[PDB]
């Protein structure tokens, strides 16, 4: 199937084992901004659901299907590939919604829906939006979408901006400097100092930060889920040209995302921005092995490239260049292996 080809088994096993735990569901549902924004977007746009047919991609415990049911949906096909599907069935039965919510276990790339649907709802956003490669499963579900069908969320804006954070740079750099020792218990580790620095900086840092560290207006790359096809997300090339607003060391790029529920009544936004209330997505910062110095008013151009891998994630490639000096910085990062810094 479409999923099994772009996903090697050992990644899919550990992936769906993770979502089979109720504790991991509780963590997502207790995210009030996330759960509350999804309910607002659905209820406020209740006629995008009233007496309609709904497909819920990756329903987890089914909380989205219940919102679609409250909005007045006629039938809701809640698809879930992890063992959490069995827990969704129990909630449908105990909320007396057996006549409206149909839990269909399996991967949406593999299941067989009985009819086409009016609207698809899902939460396919990983941290940095593209992790988990679930947006491809979301777009893949458009095969069950009617022509005038809608998508909730409809679009996703990924925002990137350069930042300065000497504390974070030093923190990761000193970690790798463990392998600078010439005599760790008499053992010279220095030869691996290279490999360690590349490893620690290959990890995107996942935590929150004050916006005062951003040195330029954010660049926006939009994915329109109505119009994109699965293959569009195999390679994501995001050019950027930042006009610097402050001088100082540019230690890397900070990433966050917004998604918009463009309904018939109003558009409702869900934002993981650093100025907005914290969510379980946090923000993502990609460090430069060597920072770049930029003056206020300089231009920092480059390209952020995302190549999809079989581990349901992306190989990130960021090249950044201060145009005024030619100071370049080439970086490779493994989105699937992030450093969770938040305490």
């Amino acid at each position: 199937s479409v999923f099994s080809e772009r996903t090697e088994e050992s990644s899919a096993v550990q992936y769906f084992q993770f979502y089979g735990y109720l504790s991991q569901q509780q963590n997502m549902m207790q995210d009030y901004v996330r759960t509350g924004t999804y309910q607002r977007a659905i209820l406020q746009n209740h006629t995008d659901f009233k007496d309609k047919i709904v497909l819920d991609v990756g329903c987890g415990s089914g909380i989205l299907s219940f919102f679609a049911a409250q909005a007045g949906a006629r039938k809701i096909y809640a698809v879930e590939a992890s063992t959490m599907a069995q827990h969704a069935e129990v909630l449908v039965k105990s909320n007396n919604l057996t006549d409206r919510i149909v839990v269909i276990p399996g991967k949406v790339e593999e299941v067989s829906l009985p009819e086409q649907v009016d609207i698809i709802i899902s939460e396919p956003m990983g941290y940095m939006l593209f992790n988990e490669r679930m947006l491809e499963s979301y777009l893949h579900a458009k095969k069950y979408l009617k022509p005038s069908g809608n998508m909730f969320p409809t679009i996703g804006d990924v925002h990137l901006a350069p930042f300065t954070d000497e504390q974070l740079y030093m923190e990761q750099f000193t970690k790798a400097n463990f392998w600078y020792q010439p005599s760790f218990h008499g053992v010279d580790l220095s030869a691996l100092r290279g490999a360690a620095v590349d490893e620690y900086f290959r990890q995107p840092v996942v935590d929150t930060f004050d916006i005062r560290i951003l040195m330029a207006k954010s660049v926006k790359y939009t994915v329109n889920f109505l119009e994109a096809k699965e293959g569009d997300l195999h390679r994501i090339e995001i050019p950027f040209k930042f006009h610097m607003l402050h001088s100082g060391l540019v230690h890397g790029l900070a990433f966050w995302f917004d998604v918009a529920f463009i309904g018939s009544i109003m558009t409702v936004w869900l934002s993981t921005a650093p100025t907005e209330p914290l969510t379980h997505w946090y923000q993502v910062r990609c460090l430069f092995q060597s920072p770049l110095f930029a003056k206020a008013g300089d231009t920092l151009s480059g390209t952020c490239l995302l190549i999809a891998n079989k581990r349901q994630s992306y190989d990130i490639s960021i090249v950044a260049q201060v145009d005024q000096t030619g100071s370049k910085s080439s970086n490779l990062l493994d989105l699937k292996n992030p450093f969770f810094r938040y305490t």
């Binding site: 550990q14 992936y15 993770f18 979502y19 991991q24 963590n27 997502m28 207790q30 995210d31 990983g126 941290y127 992790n131 988990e132 996942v206 914290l278 969510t279 379980h280 997505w281 946090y282 581990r311 994630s313 989105l335 699937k336 292996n337 992030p338 969770f340 938040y342």
Partner: peptide, 10 residues
């Protein structure tokens, strides 16, 4: 990866 969704304190 290991933990796709990160723990959020309540």
């Amino acid at each position: 990866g290991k933990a796709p969704r990160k723990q959020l304190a309540t």
